[PDB]
Design a protein around this ligand. Structure first.
Ligand SMILES: Cc1cc2nc3c(=O)[nH]c(=O)nc-3n(C[C@H](O)[C@H](O)[C@H](O)COP(=O)(O)O)c2cc1C
Length: 306
């Protein structure tokens, strides 16, 4: 790392960011990601792990600037701007990558949010609105001019949704044009892909989303390879059990055993969706309606491999 990764005055411990994911990234999950190797975790706008990064979404420059102010007063150290989501509505208005079609609304939101807070302001985007409309370099150059201190690019256009494959050509081109740190994002699913994307794009950091849902330990696995060129062995079934059971217990404190078992069901189904999707345990665990039974059924499944 050439002097590590830095967002303003903040130097990150590593070049691995846990992607913001509305509904998924709760305080328990983000904390688990950070404990598992994430250099930074991003949360939703209205006592967190590492540097407190809160992402704001919306379409009105003034409303955006207020959300930035309210969340900094609430403890946010870094404010991020969502200009990436492909079907995001905020206060009934089209936000996210919808904003990428209009560089004038982009210019206005970035200017207003940057001069509202005395905190580093970052931007999360997409290639453009459609494959014919990739304005990636334009939006990156403008973000830098508005005072943005880091830029994340998911390698898909708004139209792409979650289809096909992410591309790193746009990311590579932006990094060569812009002076601010660029974060590569989209389909970074293992350490080898991560190294390949970092090498091709020349990016300052990597952002991983969906691959952390059923494998939160992927952050240390990717960091280890980037650092040493050596792979960490797969986490044995006993260590997985310890981590998943310590997490479901934490999900029974936060929100209580009433709403908790419902969340622990979500977070366990992500692990199950990745390590055993067409399984007998998946259907039976989702049927459970008691918090103590969930922990009992969880250690029952992991003991069959012992
Ligand atoms: C369920 C879900 C929720 C998401 N929510 C947000 C969000 O609130 N803000 C945002 O910028 N991106 C959001 N994303 C985009 C992720 O950051 C996205 O997965 C990442 O940008 C690229 O894909 P990856 O998971 O392969 O890294 C979301 C994605 C998913 C699948």
């Amino acid at each position: 790392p050439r002097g590590s990764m830095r967002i303003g005055q903040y130097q990150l411990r590593n070049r691995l960011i846990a992607a913001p994911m509305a509904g998924i990234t709760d305080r328990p999950f983000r904390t688990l990601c950070y404990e598992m190797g994430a250099g930074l975790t991003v949360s939703e706008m209205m006592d967190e792990p590492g540097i407190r990064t809160v992402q704001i979404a919306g379409s009105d420059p003034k409303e955006m600037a207020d959300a930035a102010r309210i969340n900094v007063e609430s403890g946010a150290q870094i404010i991020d701007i969502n200009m990436g989501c492909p079907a995001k509505k905020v206060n009934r208005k089209l936000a996210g990558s919808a904003l990428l079609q209009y560089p004038d609304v982009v210019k206005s939101i970035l200017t207003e949010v940057v001069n509202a807070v005395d905190v580093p302001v970052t931007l999360k985007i997409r290639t453009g609105w459609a494959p014919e409309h990739r304005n990636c370099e334009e939006i990156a150059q403008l973000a830098e001019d508005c005072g943005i201190q880091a830029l994340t690019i998911h390698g898909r256009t708004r139209a792409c949704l979650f289809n096909g494959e992410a591309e790193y050509d746009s990311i590579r081109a932006v990094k060569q044009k812009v002076s601010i740190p660029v974060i590569a994002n989209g389909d970074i699913t293992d350490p080898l892909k991560a190294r390949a994307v970092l090498d091709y794009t020349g990016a300052d950091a990597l952002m991983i989303g969906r691959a952390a849902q059923g494998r939160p330990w992927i952050f240390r696995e990717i960091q280890h390879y980037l650092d040493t060129g050596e792979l960490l062995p797969p986490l044995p079934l006993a260590e997985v059990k310890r981590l998943l059971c310590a997490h479901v217990r934490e999900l029974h404190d936060f929100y209580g055993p009433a709403k908790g078992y419902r969340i622990a069901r979500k977070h366990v189904s992500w692990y199950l969706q990745e390590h055993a999707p067409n399984d007998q345990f998946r259907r039976t665990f989702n049927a459970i309606e008691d918090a103590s039974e969930q922990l009992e059924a969880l250690e029952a499944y992991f003991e069959n491999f012992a």
